[PDB]
């Protein structure tokens, strides 16, 4: 019995007639490159991607961010070509590149990167960390506005918050320094949330900081809707991820319903879901910036539960499933003597009635 | 499943075969997989200090 293929087979296009007059591969890297192309294509037969691939929806994730900038490609391309000619004309750059002693300045690469393609990288990174999925239920946005956050540790040092770098609760005990480029007359809204910190509800999040109606770049002038509260990742709970969200307001907004007392050491008021927050303010508010870090437990977290929150520190533990053992049989034929220890609860001798 | 077969470069017999194939051909072979059912573990509350 035979069934006809449900579609074109892999190597059908090849002509077998002039098999001696066909370009071969001749190399392993040239076959490997074609083999990766056909591995990332849809097929009618069963594939590893079907059973393990991360399922996605056909509905393209909507964009809720700011519009892109408008740039003249022709005038841009012209300036870039000219600069390369000048750089290549210098014989000292040719000699350094031939002797393998040249190097690029890492500080200038990052300043231009943050302007051109940093937002798209930060977006790709946030999708990997699962921020859009949890915060906005799949909706995406490009962070057009670079958000520079940094925690003051001591009097001379700074711990920069980028996109997933580790930061301790000891360094994050006091509010950070937030700077971002904005025009005069604009209104913004900052926000800090713990996606994984919640102790009771999985889906919910804790609100750590909320500043509303910020004029321009001056963060202090902004109203303090929710005071700063340091992260308190429980012990044995893993690594958490806190996100700084920057919204661009179109007009002055009233956050009376989202207001929280000063201080707010109750975890039921701190509870907060970003999706609902933005959904009722999406008409007048738009996401513009993003930054996040990862946090573990340290000794300072015990000071937060005891003193600030006036509660007992919860301690978790990673527990694994109990090992599998087949059903014990009366005559375990050919099994070693230690077969009986696998079904034994206690290790101390028993004596029964005696 | 049916997946694309890429041998290891050290393996000479298989690498001497793909270098003689026409450009555009790809070799396929049948692979068996196990899709895990249970997670590595869970975080459980053990104390309130």
């Amino acid at each position: 019995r035979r069934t006809p293929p449900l579609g074109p087979m892999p190597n059908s296009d090849i002509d077998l007639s002039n098999l001696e007059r066909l370009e071969k591969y001749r190399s392993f890297d040239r076959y490997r490159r074609r083999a990766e192309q056909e591995a990332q294509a849809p097929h009618w037969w069963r594939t590893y991607r079907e059973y393990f691939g991360e399922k996605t929806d056909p509905k393209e994730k909507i964009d809720i961010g700011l519009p892109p900038p408008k740039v003249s490609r022709t005038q841009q391309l012209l300036e870039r070509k000219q600069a390369i000619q000048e750089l290549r004309a210098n014989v000292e750059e040719e000699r350094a590149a031939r002797l393998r002693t040249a190097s690029v300045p890492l500080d200038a690469v990052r300043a231009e990167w943050e302007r051109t393609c940093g937002p798209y990288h930060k977006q790709r990174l946030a999708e990997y960390y699962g921020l859009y999925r949890d915060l906005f239920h799949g909706a995406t946005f490009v962070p057009r506005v670079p958000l520079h956050v940094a925690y003051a540790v001591g009097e001379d040092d700074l711990m920069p918050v980028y996109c997933g770098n580790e930061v301790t609760p000891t360094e994050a005990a006091q509010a950070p320094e937030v700077t971002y480029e904005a025009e005069e007359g604009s209104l913004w809204t900052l926000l800090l949330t713990s996606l994984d910190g919640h102790l009771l509800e999985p889906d919910a999040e804790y609100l750590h900081w909320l500043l509303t109606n910020i004029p321009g770049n001056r963060v202090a002038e902004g109203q303090v809707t929710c005071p700063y509260l340091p992260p308190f990742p429980a012990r044995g709970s893993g690594i958490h991820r806190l996100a700084f969200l920057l919204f661009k307001q179109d007009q002055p907004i009233d956050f009376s319903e989202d207001a929280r007392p000063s201080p707010c050491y109750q975890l039921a008021q701190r509870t907060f879901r970003t999706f609902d927050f933005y959904k009722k303010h999406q008409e007048t508010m738009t996401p513009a910036g993003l930054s996040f870090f990862q946090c573990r437990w340290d000794d300072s977290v015990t000071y937060i539960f005891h003193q600030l929150l006036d509660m007992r520190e919860p301690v978790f533990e990673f527990v694994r499933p109990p090992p599998y053992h087949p059903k014990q049989k009366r005559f375990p034929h050919r099994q070693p003597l230690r077969y009986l220890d696998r079904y034994r609860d206690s290790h101390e001798p028993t004596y029964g009635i005696y | 499943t049916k997946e694309v077969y890429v041998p290891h470069p050290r393996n000479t017999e298989a690498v001497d075969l793909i270098t003689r194939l026409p450009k555009g051909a790809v070799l396929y072979k049948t692979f068996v997989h196990v899709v895990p059912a249970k997670p590595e573990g869970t975080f459980k509350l053990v104390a309130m200090l």
């Binding site: 019995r1 449900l6 001696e20 | 049916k2 194939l21």
Partner: peptide
Amino acid sequence: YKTKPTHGIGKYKHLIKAEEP
């Protein structure tokens, strides 16, 4: 498997020159 539509997907020796001393 011979009865299945994806039978013959692993065939490779028709793409190679017959080299039989």
